[PDB]
Each structure stands twice: as structure tokens, then as C-alpha cells.
Structure 1
Amino acid sequence: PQITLWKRPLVTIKIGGQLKEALLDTGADDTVIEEMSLPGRWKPKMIGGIGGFIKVRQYDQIIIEICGHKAIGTVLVGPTPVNIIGRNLLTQIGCTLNF
């Protein structure tokens, strides 16, 4: 698909058996989801951006389905104001910016 940017590029994702809405964010290095349980090992991480830093849990090798495309990668879980799909997963679905 071709997604215009007149509104926030929100899409449905499937993660940890749950359907959620998330923002396709080219400015994010990482994928960050609001509090939820994920299986496996995790380690703490700090991520920064506008407003400063938040502490999150880093889960590796998490399968995700984004707008119907399956991928795998690291998923961070913590107090983000919005679920964001960052570059680490956007690359896997072949997402590019075009102008």
C-alpha cells in the first residue's frame, strides 16, 4: 500500500496474540509498545526522544504482524504514549519513504 501523511499513519498490528493500533514511525529507531506481557527473557533499556527518556523492557525475537506482513525483531515495552513501529520492523516489511 501507499500511505499518505494527511493523518497519523496508524495501522493494526498483532503482537503476543493481541490486536493493537500502532503508529508507523520513521523517526523511531525501535518499536515500543504500551504495557503488556510478552514471553521470554527481557533486559532493561532507556530510550530517548522528545521529552527525554523512559525505561522499558527489551524482548528479543518477537514475531509481529503489521498491516498483514509478518516480521520478527526486538520489541520494547513500557510507558510510551502511543504504540510505535520503528525502523527495526519497518525495514522488514519493506517500508520506504517516497517523494
Structure 2
Amino acid sequence: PQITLWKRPFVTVKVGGQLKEALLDTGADNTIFEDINLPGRWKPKMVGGIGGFLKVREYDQVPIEIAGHKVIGTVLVGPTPVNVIGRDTMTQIGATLNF
């Protein structure tokens, strides 16, 4: 699709076998969800946003179904107020900014 930016750009994704909604965020390096169940082991990570740092669990090499593609990669989980799809995921579906 071509997404204009008059409203927040949300997409539906499947993660952990559940349908979730997340914000396409080209200013986020990483993909971050709250309240989901990922496979495998995780390691602790801290992420620094506009207001300070956030403690998360990092799950490497897990699947996200997004834009009709299986993307395997890193997903962070923590008490973010909004689920976000970052560049780590968007590069795998060939997303671009066009201006």
C-alpha cells in the first residue's frame, strides 16, 4: 500500500499467533509490543526513548506476520503505551519513505 500520514499509520500483525495492532514508526530502531507471548528465550535490554529509558525483554529470531510476509527477527516486549513496528521489521518488507 501507499500510506498517507494524516492519521497514525497502524497495521495489523500476527505475533505469537495473535492478531495485534501496531504503529509503523520509522523513528523506532526496534519493534516493541506490550502483552504478548513469544517463543524461546529472552534477554534483558534497555531502550532509550524521548523521555528516558524503558526496560524490555528481547526475543531474537521470532516470527511476525506483517504485510502478508513472514518476518523473522528481533521483537522487544515491555510496557510501552503503543505497540510499534520499527525499522528492524520494516526493512524486511521493503518499506520506503517517498517524498
Do structure 1's residue 12 and structure 2's residue 12 form an aligned pair?
A: yes
- Tell me how far 1:35 sits from its aligned partner: 2.2
**Root-mean-square deviation (CA), in Å?**
0.8
Q: What one-letter code is carried by the residue in structure 2 that aligns with 1:48?
A: G
Match of 2:63 in 1: 63
Gaps of 5+ in 1: none
Q: TM-score, normalised by structure 2?
A: 0.96
Give 2:47's aligned residue.
47
Residues 3-46 of structure 1: CA distance to partner in whole angstroms, max 9, x if unpaired? 00000000100001000000010000000000222110100000
Identical residues among aligned pairs (%): 79
TM-score after normalising by structure 1:
0.96
8 A contact 2:13–2:21 mirrored in 1: yes
Query: 1:69 Cα shift?
Result: 2.3
